[PDB]
Design a protein around this ligand. Structure first.
Ligand SMILES: Nc1nc2c(ncn2[C@@H]2O[C@H](COP(=O)(O)OP(=O)(O)OP(=O)(O)O)[C@@H](O)[C@H]2O)c(=O)[nH]1
Ligand SMILES: [Mg+2]
Length: 216
Protein backbone atom coordinates (compact mmCIF):
# COMPACT_ATOMS: atom_id res chain seq x y z
CA UNK A 1 0.00 0.00 0.00
CA UNK A 2 1.25 3.55 -0.71
CA UNK A 3 1.67 5.66 2.42
CA UNK A 4 1.10 9.42 2.34
CA UNK A 5 2.85 12.08 4.39
CA UNK A 6 0.95 15.32 4.99
CA UNK A 7 2.89 18.46 3.98
CA UNK A 8 1.16 20.54 6.64
CA UNK A 9 -0.83 22.41 3.99
CA UNK A 10 -4.31 21.04 3.23
CA UNK A 11 -4.16 22.79 -0.16
CA UNK A 12 -0.83 21.17 -1.14
CA UNK A 13 -1.99 17.80 0.24
CA UNK A 14 -5.07 17.98 -1.99
CA UNK A 15 -2.97 18.71 -5.08
CA UNK A 16 -0.74 15.74 -4.24
CA UNK A 17 -3.72 13.35 -3.71
CA UNK A 18 -3.33 13.34 0.06
CA UNK A 19 0.33 13.94 0.72
CA UNK A 20 3.80 12.92 -0.45
CA UNK A 21 3.80 9.21 -1.46
CA UNK A 22 5.97 6.33 -0.39
CA UNK A 23 7.30 4.10 -3.22
CA UNK A 24 7.86 7.31 -5.26
CA UNK A 25 10.38 10.07 -5.80
CA UNK A 26 8.76 13.50 -5.49
CA UNK A 27 10.86 16.37 -6.94
CA UNK A 28 10.11 19.94 -5.97
CA UNK A 29 11.77 22.52 -8.21
CA UNK A 30 11.68 26.28 -8.31
CA UNK A 31 13.78 29.42 -7.90
CA UNK A 32 15.65 30.57 -4.81
CA UNK A 33 13.22 31.24 -1.92
CA UNK A 34 10.40 29.22 -3.47
CA UNK A 35 9.99 26.95 -0.40
CA UNK A 36 11.84 23.72 -1.28
CA UNK A 37 13.97 23.55 1.88
CA UNK A 38 11.14 24.72 4.12
CA UNK A 39 8.90 21.98 2.70
CA UNK A 40 11.70 19.49 3.43
CA UNK A 41 12.03 20.65 7.05
CA UNK A 42 8.23 20.47 7.48
CA UNK A 43 7.95 16.85 6.01
CA UNK A 44 10.85 15.74 8.30
CA UNK A 45 8.58 16.54 11.26
CA UNK A 46 5.21 15.51 9.70
CA UNK A 47 6.38 11.98 8.82
CA UNK A 48 7.00 11.38 12.55
CA UNK A 49 3.31 11.93 13.43
CA UNK A 50 0.98 8.89 13.70
CA UNK A 51 -1.10 8.05 10.64
CA UNK A 52 -4.29 9.68 11.86
CA UNK A 53 -2.39 12.92 12.10
CA UNK A 54 -0.87 12.70 8.62
CA UNK A 55 2.46 10.94 9.38
CA UNK A 56 3.86 7.42 9.10
CA UNK A 57 5.47 7.07 12.57
CA UNK A 58 8.68 7.23 10.60
CA UNK A 59 12.31 8.19 10.83
CA UNK A 60 14.07 10.47 8.26
CA UNK A 61 17.39 10.30 6.34
CA UNK A 62 18.47 13.71 5.02
CA UNK A 63 21.33 14.12 2.54
CA UNK A 64 22.18 17.83 2.70
CA UNK A 65 24.33 19.26 -0.07
CA UNK A 66 24.30 23.04 0.59
CA UNK A 67 24.46 23.21 4.43
CA UNK A 68 20.84 24.37 4.72
CA UNK A 69 19.53 21.81 7.24
CA UNK A 70 18.64 23.80 10.43
CA UNK A 71 18.16 21.74 13.57
CA UNK A 72 16.52 24.73 15.30
CA UNK A 73 13.96 25.08 12.55
CA UNK A 74 13.06 21.43 13.09
CA UNK A 75 12.71 22.02 16.83
CA UNK A 76 10.47 25.03 16.21
CA UNK A 77 8.21 23.22 13.80
CA UNK A 78 8.00 20.27 16.16
CA UNK A 79 7.35 22.46 19.29
CA UNK A 80 4.59 24.32 17.47
CA UNK A 81 2.87 21.20 16.28
CA UNK A 82 2.89 19.79 19.89
CA UNK A 83 5.87 17.28 19.47
CA UNK A 84 9.01 17.00 21.63
CA UNK A 85 11.64 18.94 19.64
CA UNK A 86 14.50 16.78 20.84
CA UNK A 87 12.77 13.39 20.15
CA UNK A 88 11.88 14.63 16.62
CA UNK A 89 15.51 15.63 16.01
CA UNK A 90 16.74 12.23 17.25
CA UNK A 91 14.83 10.54 14.44
CA UNK A 92 16.44 12.60 11.62
CA UNK A 93 19.74 11.26 10.38
CA UNK A 94 21.57 14.03 8.54
CA UNK A 95 24.63 13.61 6.37
CA UNK A 96 26.44 16.35 4.45
CA UNK A 97 27.38 15.38 0.92
CA UNK A 98 30.73 17.00 -0.01
CA UNK A 99 30.53 16.32 -3.78
CA UNK A 100 28.37 14.36 -6.22
CA UNK A 101 30.36 11.12 -5.81
CA UNK A 102 30.12 11.33 -2.01
CA UNK A 103 26.36 12.04 -2.48
CA UNK A 104 26.07 8.76 -4.41
CA UNK A 105 27.89 6.86 -1.71
CA UNK A 106 25.65 8.35 0.98
CA UNK A 107 22.61 6.73 -0.73
CA UNK A 108 24.24 3.29 -0.26
CA UNK A 109 24.85 4.13 3.39
CA UNK A 110 21.27 5.15 3.70
CA UNK A 111 20.28 1.53 2.84
CA UNK A 112 22.24 0.33 5.87
CA UNK A 113 20.32 2.66 8.19
CA UNK A 114 17.04 1.77 6.53
CA UNK A 115 17.72 -1.98 7.02
CA UNK A 116 18.64 -1.36 10.61
CA UNK A 117 15.46 0.51 11.47
CA UNK A 118 13.17 -1.69 9.48
CA UNK A 119 12.46 -3.77 12.81
CA UNK A 120 11.94 -0.79 14.88
CA UNK A 121 8.73 1.09 15.66
CA UNK A 122 10.12 4.08 13.67
CA UNK A 123 11.37 2.65 10.34
CA UNK A 124 12.74 5.17 7.85
CA UNK A 125 9.80 6.50 5.91
CA UNK A 126 11.32 9.59 4.29
CA UNK A 127 14.66 10.18 2.49
CA UNK A 128 15.35 13.83 1.60
CA UNK A 129 18.03 14.93 -0.83
CA UNK A 130 18.35 18.75 -0.71
CA UNK A 131 19.68 19.64 -3.30
CA UNK A 132 19.59 16.64 -5.64
CA UNK A 133 21.37 18.48 -8.47
CA UNK A 134 23.59 21.23 -7.02
CA UNK A 135 26.76 19.15 -7.00
CA UNK A 136 26.09 17.62 -10.38
CA UNK A 137 25.58 21.12 -11.87
CA UNK A 138 28.94 22.36 -10.37
CA UNK A 139 31.01 19.30 -11.35
CA UNK A 140 29.86 18.34 -14.79
CA UNK A 141 30.12 21.41 -16.98
CA UNK A 142 31.26 22.09 -20.57
CA UNK A 143 31.22 20.18 -23.85
CA UNK A 144 30.22 16.55 -23.26
CA UNK A 145 28.89 17.31 -19.78
CA UNK A 146 25.19 17.11 -20.57
CA UNK A 147 25.37 13.38 -21.39
CA UNK A 148 27.74 12.54 -18.56
CA UNK A 149 25.74 14.53 -15.97
CA UNK A 150 22.48 13.01 -17.10
CA UNK A 151 23.88 9.40 -16.96
CA UNK A 152 25.31 9.94 -13.41
CA UNK A 153 22.04 11.49 -12.18
CA UNK A 154 20.04 8.66 -13.82
CA UNK A 155 22.12 6.09 -11.81
CA UNK A 156 21.65 8.13 -8.60
CA UNK A 157 17.88 8.43 -9.22
CA UNK A 158 17.72 4.69 -9.96
CA UNK A 159 19.39 4.00 -6.62
CA UNK A 160 16.88 6.23 -4.91
CA UNK A 161 13.86 4.72 -6.71
CA UNK A 162 15.09 1.22 -5.65
CA UNK A 163 15.15 2.29 -1.95
CA UNK A 164 11.66 3.97 -2.25
CA UNK A 165 10.13 0.78 -3.73
CA UNK A 166 12.07 -1.93 -1.85
CA UNK A 167 11.58 -0.33 1.63
CA UNK A 168 8.29 1.60 1.16
CA UNK A 169 9.88 5.03 1.64
CA UNK A 170 8.93 8.47 0.30
CA UNK A 171 11.91 10.03 -1.46
CA UNK A 172 11.77 13.84 -1.62
CA UNK A 173 14.35 15.69 -3.69
CA UNK A 174 14.82 19.31 -4.54
CA UNK A 175 16.15 21.11 -7.62
CA UNK A 176 16.81 24.86 -8.09
CA UNK A 177 15.82 26.30 -11.43
CA UNK A 178 14.74 20.84 -21.85
CA UNK A 179 16.79 18.28 -19.90
CA UNK A 180 15.35 14.79 -19.03
CA UNK A 181 13.96 14.07 -15.50
CA UNK A 182 12.98 10.81 -13.87
CA UNK A 183 11.13 11.71 -10.63
CA UNK A 184 7.76 10.03 -10.19
CA UNK A 185 6.06 13.35 -9.51
CA UNK A 186 7.37 16.81 -10.28
CA UNK A 187 6.03 19.82 -8.35
CA UNK A 188 6.85 23.38 -9.45
CA UNK A 189 7.02 25.90 -6.57
CA UNK A 190 7.01 29.70 -6.99
CA UNK A 191 6.41 32.85 -5.01
CA UNK A 192 2.99 34.42 -4.99
CA UNK A 193 1.49 37.63 -3.72
CA UNK A 194 1.28 38.27 0.00
CA UNK A 195 4.14 35.99 0.97
CA UNK A 196 2.30 32.90 -0.32
CA UNK A 197 3.86 30.10 -2.31
CA UNK A 198 2.03 28.45 -5.24
CA UNK A 199 2.54 24.80 -6.26
CA UNK A 200 1.62 23.21 -9.64
CA UNK A 201 2.06 19.58 -10.73
CA UNK A 202 4.02 19.22 -13.93
CA UNK A 203 -5.41 23.20 -10.16
CA UNK A 204 -2.71 24.95 -8.09
CA UNK A 205 -2.17 24.86 -4.35
CA UNK A 206 -1.36 27.91 -2.21
CA UNK A 207 0.46 27.77 1.10
CA UNK A 208 2.33 29.89 3.66
CA UNK A 209 5.63 29.47 5.48
CA UNK A 210 5.03 29.93 9.22
CA UNK A 211 6.15 28.98 12.75
CA UNK A 212 4.65 25.52 11.97
CA UNK A 213 6.69 25.17 8.76
CA UNK A 214 4.31 24.91 5.86
CA UNK A 215 0.58 25.39 6.29
CA UNK A 216 -2.29 26.94 4.28
N1 LIG B 1 9.89 31.05 9.56
C1 LIG B 1 10.98 30.79 8.92
N2 LIG B 1 10.97 31.14 7.57
C2 LIG B 1 12.12 30.87 6.94
C3 LIG B 1 13.22 30.24 7.54
N3 LIG B 1 14.21 30.11 6.68
C4 LIG B 1 13.71 30.57 5.50
N4 LIG B 1 12.46 31.07 5.69
C5 LIG B 1 11.58 31.62 4.63
O1 LIG B 1 11.25 30.53 3.77
C6 LIG B 1 11.32 30.94 2.40
C7 LIG B 1 11.57 29.72 1.53
O2 LIG B 1 12.91 29.45 1.72
P1 LIG B 1 13.57 28.04 1.30
O3 LIG B 1 12.64 26.89 1.44
O4 LIG B 1 14.89 27.92 2.01
O5 LIG B 1 13.85 28.29 -0.28
P2 LIG B 1 14.42 27.26 -1.31
O6 LIG B 1 13.41 26.99 -2.33
O7 LIG B 1 15.02 26.09 -0.63
O8 LIG B 1 15.61 28.10 -1.97
P3 LIG B 1 17.05 27.71 -2.58
O9 LIG B 1 17.68 26.72 -1.60
O10 LIG B 1 17.87 29.01 -2.51
O11 LIG B 1 16.91 27.17 -3.97
C8 LIG B 1 12.42 32.00 2.46
O12 LIG B 1 12.18 32.96 1.47
C9 LIG B 1 12.26 32.68 3.80
O13 LIG B 1 11.32 33.73 3.60
C10 LIG B 1 13.17 29.92 8.88
O14 LIG B 1 14.15 29.38 9.39
N5 LIG B 1 12.05 30.23 9.58
MG1 LIG C 1 16.93 25.35 -0.31
Amino acid sequence: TIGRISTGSKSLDKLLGGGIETQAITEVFGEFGSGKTQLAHTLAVMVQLPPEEGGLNGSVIWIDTENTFRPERIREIAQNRGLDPDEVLKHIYVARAFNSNHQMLLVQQAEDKIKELLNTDRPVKLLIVDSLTSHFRSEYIGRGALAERQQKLAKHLADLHRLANLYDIAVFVTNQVILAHSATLRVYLRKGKGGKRIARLIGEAVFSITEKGIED
